[PDB]
């Protein structure tokens, strides 16, 4: 997983790195993400990668969708 | 007492550099009552992120109308709380009022209407 990121370091294209990562976090083990963040820290990799892999960015995007488009049945409460 | 997030920003008049030096902390205006001039103290103190220009806790007197509130005194960056003592107590300050994050915005904060009023209130009124 690590090696894959090293190639994209060289490109310096933020868009591509992000798109790969977002798919990886969904699938990947709770364990897998945790050791990978350490490794990337020690390379000197941009902190922007580390943040997505902590998974809080995706939590926020998915939270936004829910708030705006929520259609509440009022009948449930009654 | 009237608290808000603000940081220090270097004052300048040679070239008008006036770039913020980041910090976080808070600015605290105390209404006082000292004399009819008000002397509402603009205290600047780091409550947080002391990194950047330390600006050790110090309270500054206010002489009303001599201060010139001008939003983009630098004319290079937003959120320039400018207090112009005719270079005697002239310090510049940079808002970080979390509302769209720290980011400098022209014509002060993201809550445009509010901070314009706040600014008239402190400078003009004297206790």
């Amino acid at each position: 997983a690590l090696q894959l990121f090293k190639k994209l370091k060289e490109e310096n294209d933020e868009g591509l790195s992000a798109q790969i990562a977002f798919d990886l976090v969904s699938s990947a083990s709770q364990q897998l993400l945790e050791i990978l963040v350490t490794e990337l820290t020690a390379q000197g990799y941009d902190p922007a990668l580390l943040n997505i892999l902590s998974g809080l960015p995706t939590c926020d995007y998915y939270n936004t969708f829910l708030l705006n488009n929520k259609n509440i049945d009022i009948g449930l409460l009654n | 007492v009237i608290k808000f997030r603000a940081g220090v920003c270097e004052y300048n008049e040679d070239s008008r550099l006036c770039t913020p030096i980041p910090v976080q902390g808070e600015i605290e205006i105390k209404p006082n009552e000292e004399e009819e001039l008000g002397f509402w103290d603009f205290e600047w103190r780091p409550t947080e992120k002391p990194v950047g220009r330390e600006l050790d806790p110090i309270s500054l007197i206010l002489i009303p109308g001599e201060t010139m509130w001008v939003p983009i005194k630098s004319s290079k960056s937003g959120r320039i709380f400018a207090l112009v003592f005719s270079s005697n107590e002239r310090y510049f300050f940079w808002l970080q009022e979390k509302n769209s994050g720290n980011l400098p915005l022209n014509e002060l904060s993201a809550k445009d209407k509010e901070i314009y009023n706040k600014m008239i209130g402190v400078l003009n009124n004297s206790s």
Partner: protein
Amino acid sequence: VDNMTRILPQQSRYISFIKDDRFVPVRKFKGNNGVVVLRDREPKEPVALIETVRQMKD
């Protein structure tokens, strides 16, 4: 169909982004629901934007 709405998977299969439109994804669309990263052709053009919730709360 506006971005950031509920979309059933069946509808999603048949979606193709306008290529003239600024937003076209960096690499090809998943073909199905989930977070898809767009290339912004011009940031300079003003777009009505919905800040991520984190920022709204700060």
